């Protein structure tokens, strides 16, 4: 109502549930909107955010809709620390969920969590928004086990300077193509080489990418042109759509409808 843009979100109609999760740039709670909408409400941590920057990148993600895209409900940009309010989803980071062994996941699972993603990127790409930090840590997971992108274009507006280039710890070193360890090039191209360390991820139950390296070790290895290699779990069909991703030349690597395309096929025929 009064006071409130379409993007703004007045706090007073949240319930707050559970405490989901806490860690550097805030605190996560489960609650209601309106008693009866579930939701996600971030806290965001004061500090560690170019918070007006966001806010205005928030008007245009509102526009962003896709079913394995992770809703954006609103921002509440009254007070401190500021919410940012989306989609609930239910078990959680892919992350974490792919490494509980209980599941037992089969590969056709496991490949439906690749075509999940894989469609909120060609979305995406059809918008020309870069995620710009695909990973399996940034993906989360419904109650019906349906995977969806989450924190997309977030690392724009961080900032603590180890996440912010190549050299920080916090750089996500092992979903990055040469041509951003080497000079910093983002592109549709740098998001495709993520997906396929993601579909990795996927495939090998979590694993870190390159766990016996550290991460200047794995910049030395990818840019002599060496890869991850096959995921047990990966057949030799889903092992050629993930290795697509890493091509020296980014103009080689495939576009997010192309992969869409070669995971349908691997579908239909395994
Ligand atoms: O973490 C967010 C979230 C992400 C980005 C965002 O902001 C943006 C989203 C998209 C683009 C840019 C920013 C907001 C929110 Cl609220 C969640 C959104 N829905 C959720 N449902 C369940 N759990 C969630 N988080 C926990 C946190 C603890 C973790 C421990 O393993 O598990 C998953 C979230």
């Known amino acids: 109502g009064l006071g409130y843009g379409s993007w703004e979100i007045d706090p007073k109609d949240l319930t707050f549930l559970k405490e989901l999760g806490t860690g550097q740039f805030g605190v996560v709670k489960y609650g209601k909107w309106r008693g009866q909408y579930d939701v996600a409400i971030?806290?965001?941590?004061?500090?560690?955010?170019?918070?007006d920057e966001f806010i205005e990148?928030?008007?245009?993600?509102?526009?962003?809709?896709?079913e394995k895209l992770v809703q954006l409900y609103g921002v509440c940009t009254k007070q401190r620390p500021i919410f940012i309010i989306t989609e609930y989803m239910a078990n959680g980071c892919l992350l974490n969920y792919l490494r509980e062994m209980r599941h037992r996941f089969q590969?056709?699972?496991?490949?439906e969590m690749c075509k999940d993603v894989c469609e909120a990127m060609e979305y995406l790409e059809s918008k020309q928004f870069l995620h710009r930090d695909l990973a399996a840590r940034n993906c989360l997971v419904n109650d019906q086990g349906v995977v969806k992108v989450s924190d997309?274009?977030?690392?724009?507006?961080?900032?603590?300077?180890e996440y912010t280039s190549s050299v920080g710890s916090k750089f996500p070193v092992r979903w990055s193509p040469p041509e951003v360890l080497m000079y910093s090039k983002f592109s549709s191209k740098s998001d495709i080489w993520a997906f396929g360390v993601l579909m990795w991820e996927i495939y090998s139950l979590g694993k870190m990418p390159y766990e016996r390296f550290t991460n200047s070790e794995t910049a030395e290895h990818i840019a002599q042109g060496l890869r991850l290699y096959r995921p047990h779990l990966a057949s030799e069909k889903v092992?050629?759509?993930?290795?697509?991703?890493?091509?020296?030349?980014a103009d080689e690597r495939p576009t997010?409808?192309?992969?869409?395309?070669?995971?349908?096929?691997?579908?239909?025929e395994e």
């Open 256 to 268: 997010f409808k192309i992969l869409l395309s070669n995971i349908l096929d691997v579908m239909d």
């Open 57 to 66: 990148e928030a008007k245009v993600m509102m526009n962003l809709s896709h």
């Open 107 to 111: 590969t056709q699972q496991l490949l």
């Open 152 to 161: 997309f274009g977030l690392s724009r507006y961080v900032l603590d300077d």
């Open 42 to 51: 971030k806290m965001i941590k004061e500090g560690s955010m170019s918070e």
């Open 239 to 249: 092992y050629t759509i993930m290795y697509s991703c890493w091509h020296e030349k």
